[PDB]
UniProtKB/Swiss-Prot annotation, chains A, B:
It comes from Zea mays (Maize). This is Pyruvate, phosphate dikinase 1, chloroplastic. The active site is at H444, C822. The keyword Plastid applies. Its EC number is 2.7.9.1. The keyword Zinc-finger does not apply. The lineage of its organism: Eukaryota, Viridiplantae, Streptophyta, Embryophyta, Tracheophyta. Pfam families: PEP-utilizers, PEP-utilizers_C, PPDK_N. Pathway: Photosynthesis; C4 acid pathway. Phosphorylation of Thr-442 in the dark inactivates the enzyme, dephosphorylation upon light stimulation reactivates the enzyme. More highly phosphorylated when grown under high rather than low light regimes (70 vs 900 umol photons/m-2/s). the degree of phosphorylation is strictly regulated by light intensity and the light/dark transition has no influence. Phosphorylated in both mesophyll and bundle sheath cells. The phosphorylation at Ser-443 may be important for the phosphorylation at Thr-442 and may also be regulated by light intensity.
Length: 862, 862
């Protein structure tokens, strides 16, 4: 067989490697057959046959039809049926298929080899209504796809029939009605084509083949190929196969199933079977009717899992007590099911760890990191609305309408659902105290929740929040302060009442799976945390330390801390401006001690003040901003106003911030370094292992870094002397300025470690203000100008080149330079993959993204 | 002579090439002597002698003193005088000097070999008061620099003498008073050193030599060397020479001069001579007293110019009818003098063009591009204040206090001086109409003037501008509207009245000099102009076309045009938003026709709209902004407010601007392209040669550029068809986004030319908001973190690498890719030099910077 390959249970001339000749689908059919799967017999016309076709004057090649006939004869003899015979009928299916995906190809044609005589022979065991309904559809399909007859001509008589009969929803058409349409359809063949419908099965087949070959050069198919610059190909193949039915009596039927439970992972066939074809009946009912069939099904499923090393979602049809395998694909499943299956298959000795790692997707794993309801279905009779999955996870708490109230609930150890028509940066404190957030995937609330791993249903516009009064209008029900409400941040649903939460998992399979993940990955995964509590949550999620502790975020923690910063900025005498810095030192030192204890034994990287001073000022009308500052700091109006204007900036993202501030106000960096080293020593004295790292933000030259490094080392010497003890530590820098990447060799002389700030790097490289990019990104994506939003998915070609240059040049200067990334791409699978192959030492992300990062760092290596 | 080289008129063992052994100064002295200059005889101790010194146990090397003695004997026999002899006295000078500049070295010591006996022998012909005053100074100097005796010990007796005598301003001290101090000074030698002042000339010399060798390892000298990582050196040399005086009678004197007039360039000795030493007398008086001397001077000057190929500023001393050449250096001169001298020296066959080009500095040339007063001195008795040279040039006009009034004066063809305590972006229209600007080098007014080439004296804080009333308080005089006032933007002066302006130059020397400049340069120099009048001013300054015409600046031209843009932004129906665009089309088309005619025969590159739409909105309180917009566009309050907020941005430099706007609102780019092509055809039909170029701003990907290019080419096809004519044109892009540089190979597929926008490129590369960088740049420069402001002087190491990468990769893709730069570095000498060697095709700057650019593009090549 050089152009036509037949195939059947345990028989096939082709093999799984011939994707070129047999096309993707052909090669798979051959493989499925080659391993003993009960697949209806058939044959495949190679892509060469399609090439010789278009080349030999775009006409049917010599000898092909001969081989095709051999194939069919082989299939007929195999199935115990013949093409165009009422007694022993043989109906076929004709599908196309290239080596790769390709649109515009001839649509699948079912039940070929059918005619008035065969249709009657079919009504025999399957029924009359089914036979002629099928004959009608075939005439339509074969006519439109093979003969190029407008479907409209056919639909013109189908609806013109109801206009006389009495219905429009086809299903009422009786047997005779169908026979009448069959006649009317054939006349369409004479009216449109001039000639009659080919009643000879062989003629149909021939045409169908030619129809497929011609589909390779179709408009859609060529545009597609022309767009992706797809060349070499050679054409499409022709996959022919036998039709089968489960309506030839009670000794037949159809069913679908997952070789394993797609929700729990339990190793048990999970599906349903329909007898003679109503509503489905479970599997156990099949064997109790078709024993030899159910047994064949079982052996088929075992084969699938043994060979494909994966759970399968299939469609089978048992015809007259004989089972048939029609469709098989890797089965979708929940994360719970994904992890259990991966682990059982390893324990079963079916797959090894390195392969199991690829069986759990980031989406699967995410599901297991947040609490979930016990039965999202059991509460269908209670759902009262649906919004957007701003942040996955299940939550149950009492309704509240203010951050302050949420915080209050939290302080009493109680669960509250914060509900606000919309949120603001001032409610952030309450949003963290709430067990769930609900507002009337891109909303600013959603983003915040995700990092915390907090449930949040945003964009639920079908809601009205009554503030004056303490109630909210949602769906048809009204909820008032104190009433229970459930939120599903994964589905976006807003159930009513107190739905149950699945209890902690005891299987240990997640722990088992993750140990493989951690064994395989080379990248370390750190966490971005600014508080002792987040440090703990990061450690519990497997973080190997803290790659980024943002000191500015340690002040927006309380009104008191914020006022303290303002006092600093408004100081009149250095005698007081130092007193204000001294005040900030305790807050810092206290927070660092807490973070260090939580990270006992792990490296902790703390970044020097980065935001422009303007950020720590009240917001609102200028007059009011001035009033608040005077009351909070003791400054007069003139000075306050002058100071506010002086701190104002046109482009704050590139203004007076980062090391520029640290360099201009040395005392600031000296205060933070003192706070760090003193906290470190205090915790060491209590037996905590502390490995502090100090990082300088927004550096663009070696000089800026050197200046800050000198300051840090000086403070370290004094603190160590004053406390009579010394501990190791490291000084490093952020690489978020494109210039820094360019002169990374020079910068590496002073920095012991590099930490890419791809957020800022992406902003400066693209010249994109993330704060304002929302005004044109949608258009860029819609227009194909951008493939992905650079802020979510690392732009490997651009930003990526700078990361590579910087990494290479920095390590050439300091061979053991530690290199990481703390931008948000640090928790994004495709970005993490790029960082791994770029040779970075680690990635650092939010606490709850840590497991995802770990998974991604392993998957890229296997 | 292997360690000590003597030298005299036409005699010297060393030569101009021995900068290593003889040090920079030694080699020069040798060269000066080697060509027959009348330089007092002397000798130089090689740097080896200094090395052997520090190495042989930091002590005087063997044989050296022997050679030193040979040298002195040679000099004595040469001069007809002996060391330590009253009758035939010989006084020496001892200077240090390495191969390169080096601070911390032993200070120059004059009149060595002096004592009580010699001092008397000196009082003989020079006088008593001079002799002992010199002896006193020598004792002091020799004691402090050679014996390490605190000057304080000496000054303690110098002021303690006046406390008894009766004066403090040394010059009254009589001969005997000096003799008394001489005695008191020597006692300081016994009190401080223990031993007496070495009265033996030979001992002094020896010590002096050792003093110099020891100066190489001095604190200051080592820190300096340690900072610049200066190695290899080997030490400093010792230059010894004979002293000479012009106070030994009427047959002696001293004088200084320029071999050519430093103000006009006239080939005539320009200087003054002082007899026996009062107030100086001109040169002609020298010959009429010392003929053989004046004749020697003449031959010396001719030699200097013949050998050094440059005008010289010197100091000479004629002692007893014998001339001596003491100091020679290239003479400072005005730009007028620089150009005339360079051109005459070529005509004289003294230097060739390639060398003359290096004789005129950018500062020199700048002086000749703007009008100047006839005699800044003649108006000294009229100056009434002094400020900052915000923008060079002389200006004479009537005082006015509003832009509107300046514009009014201009419309009547009259000269006005705009005077405002400070200026704003709204007065820009009047500032251009004024012939001069004056406000009460970094002020925003100054910068603006420079481009226009307009006179401006900013920062003249000693001024009070009375608005209510139409007068201004300056100096002691009060000026009211209409009164004449003169401004010097070069000096910063504010003369009173109507001072005369030098008439146009007729020499033709500037034209001659510039033709050499233009012959040598390879870079073409284009101009940045947005109006027909600026295009003309650029052409008159030698611009070879327009590298950048900013279309946004073509709208801030008149209230009407600005309102038209606002109407566009506030359009309610597309039926009107197009009517608003149609309105903008005429303004554009009309301006382009004008620009094209002025640039007949030269390429004109026009850039698509670049500023964020927010920029075209009124400024002020929000409520007022809304009111104005409603009145100007017909919008209601709600919509106006919504629109204003919607256009607001956090970081406008990286927001919704440039091609992002052109891509999101295609009609905008279609309107501009139509305007361009229609203007081009209209002018071609009138016989003007038009070579239009369309440039796409702020591109970061090939896709953004392709999208805009497609739009442009479509409009070009329609316009050419509608007008039945076709002309050539080009499409290109700005390279101001770091990412664009990185993917310049891809971008080059669509762009026919690259134009670097180093302003923006520098902002994104450094992450510097130029609008806000002023808050830390001063500190960075003061702290040595930055060498230069990157926005003025191209950062070759960083921004420069991106320019190189982009240029190389872009040309590899499109070999004939035209590559230029239009950022401000395009007119900065060191930046222009970098662009030339980077292989760019051209630079484009403001109109009046064009000649400077041309000069710089030539100087880098010779
Ligand atoms: Mg950052
Ligand atoms: Mg720009």
């Amino acid at each position: 067989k050089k152009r036509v390959f037949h195939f059947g249970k345990g028989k096939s001339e082709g093999n799984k490697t011939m994707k070129e000749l047999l096309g993707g689908k052909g090669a798979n059919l051959a493989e499925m057959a080659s391993i003993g799967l009960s697949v209806p017999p058939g044959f495949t016309v190679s892509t060469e046959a399609c090439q010789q076709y278009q080349d030999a004057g775009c006409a049917l090649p010599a000898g092909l039809w001969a081989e095709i006939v051999d194939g069919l004869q082989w299939v007929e003899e195999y199935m115990g049926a013949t093409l165009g015979d009422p007694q022993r009928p043989l109906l076929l299916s004709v599908r196309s298929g290239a080596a790769v995906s390709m649109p515009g190809m001839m649509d699948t044609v079912l039940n070929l080899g059918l005619n008035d005589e065969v249709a009657a022979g079919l009504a025999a065991k399957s029924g009359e209504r089914f036979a002629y309904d099928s004959f009608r559809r075939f005439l339509d399909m074969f006519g439109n796809v093979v003969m190029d007859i407008p479907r409209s001509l056919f639909e013109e008589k189908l609806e013109h029939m109801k206009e006389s009969k009495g219905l429009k929803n086809d299903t009422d058409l009786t047997a005779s009605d169908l026979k009448e349409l069959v006649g009317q359809y054939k006349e369409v063949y004479l009216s449109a084509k001039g000639e009659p419908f080919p009643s000879d099965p062989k003629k149909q087949l021939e045409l169908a083949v030619l129809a497929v070959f011609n589909s390779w050069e179709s408009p859609r198919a060529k545009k597609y190929r022309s767009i992706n610059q797809i060349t070499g190909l050679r054409g499409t193949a022709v996959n022919v196969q036998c039709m089968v039915f489960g309506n030839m009596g009670n000794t037949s039927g159809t069913g679908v199933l997952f070789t394993r439970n797609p929700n729990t992972g339990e190793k048990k066939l999970y599906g349903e079977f329909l007898v003679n074809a109503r509503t489905p009946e479970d599997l156990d009912a099949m064997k109790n009717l078709m024993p030899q069939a159910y047994d064949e099904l079982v052996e088929n499923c075992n084969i699938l899992e043994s060979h494909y090393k994966e759970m399968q979602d299939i469609e089978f049809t048992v015809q007259e007590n004989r089972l048939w395998m029609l469709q098989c694909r890797t089965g979708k499943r929940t994360g719970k099911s994904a992890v259990k299956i991966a682990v059982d298959m390893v324990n079963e000795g079916l797959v090894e760890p390195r392969s199991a790692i690829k069986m759990v997707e980031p989406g699967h794993l995410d599901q297991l990191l947040h609490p979930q309801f016990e039965n999202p279905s059991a509460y269908k009779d209670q759902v009262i609305a649906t919004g957007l999955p701003a942040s996955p996870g299940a939550a149950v708490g009492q309704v509240v309408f203010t951050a302050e109230d949420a915080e209050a609930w939290h302080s009493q150890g109680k669960a509250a659902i914060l509900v606000r028509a919309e949120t603001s940066p001032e409610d952030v404190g309450g949003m963290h105290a709430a067990v769930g957030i609900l507002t009337e995937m891109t909303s600013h609330a959603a983003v915040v929740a995700r990092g915390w791993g907090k449930c949040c249903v945003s964009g639920c516009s079908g809601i009205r929040v009554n503030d004056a009064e303490k109630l909210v209008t949602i769906g048809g029900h009204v909820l008032r302060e104190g009433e229970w409400l459930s939120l599903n941040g994964s589905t976006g649903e807003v159930i009513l009442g107190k739905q149950p939460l699945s209890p902690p998992a005891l299987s240990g399979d997640l722990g088992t799976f993750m140990a493989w993940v951690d064994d395989v990955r080379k990248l370390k995964v750190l966490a971005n945390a600014d508080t002792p509590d987040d440090a703990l949550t990061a450690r519990n999620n497997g973080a190997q330390g803290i790659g980024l502790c943002r000191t500015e975020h340690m002040f927006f923690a309380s009104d008191e801390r914020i006022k303290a910063v303002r006092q600093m900025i408004m100081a009149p005498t250095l005698e007081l401006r130092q007193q204000a810095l001294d005040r900030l030192l305790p807050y810092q030192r206290s927070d660092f001690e807490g973070i260090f204890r939580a990270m006992d034994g792990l490296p902790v990287t703390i970044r020097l003040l980065d935001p422009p001073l303007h950020e720590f000022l009240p917001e609102g009308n200028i007059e009011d901003i001035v009033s608040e500052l005077c009351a909070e700091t003791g400054a007069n109006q003139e000075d306050a106003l002058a100071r506010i204007e002086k701190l104002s900036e046109v482009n704050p993202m590139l203004g007076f911030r980062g090391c520029r501030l640290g360099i201009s106000y040395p005392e600031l960096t000296e205060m933070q370094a003192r706070a760090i080293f003193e906290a470190a020593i205090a915790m060491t004295n209590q037996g905590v292992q502390v490995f502090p790292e100090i990082m300088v933000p927004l550096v663009g030259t070696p000089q800026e870094l050197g200046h800050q490094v000198t300051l840090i080392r000086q403070v370290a010497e004094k603190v160590f002397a004053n406390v009579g003890k010394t501990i190791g530590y490291k000084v490093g820098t952020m690489i978020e300025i494109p210039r820094a990447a360019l002169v990374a060799d020079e910068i590496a002389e002073q920095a012991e470690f590099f930490s890419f700030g791809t957020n800022d790097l992406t902003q400066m490289t693209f010249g994109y203000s993330r704060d304002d990019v929302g005004k044109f990104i949608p258009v860029y994506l819609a227009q194909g100008i951008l493939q992905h939003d650079p802020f979510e998915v690392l732009d490997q070609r651009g930003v990526g080149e700078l990361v590579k240059f910087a990494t290479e040049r920095g390590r050439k200067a300091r061979p053991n330079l530690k290199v990481g990334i703390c931008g948000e791409h640090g928790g994004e699978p495709s970005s993490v993959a790029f960082f791994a192959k770029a040779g970075l030492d680690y990635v650092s992300c939010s606490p709850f993204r840590v497991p995802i990062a770990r998974l991604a760092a392993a998957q890229v290596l296997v």
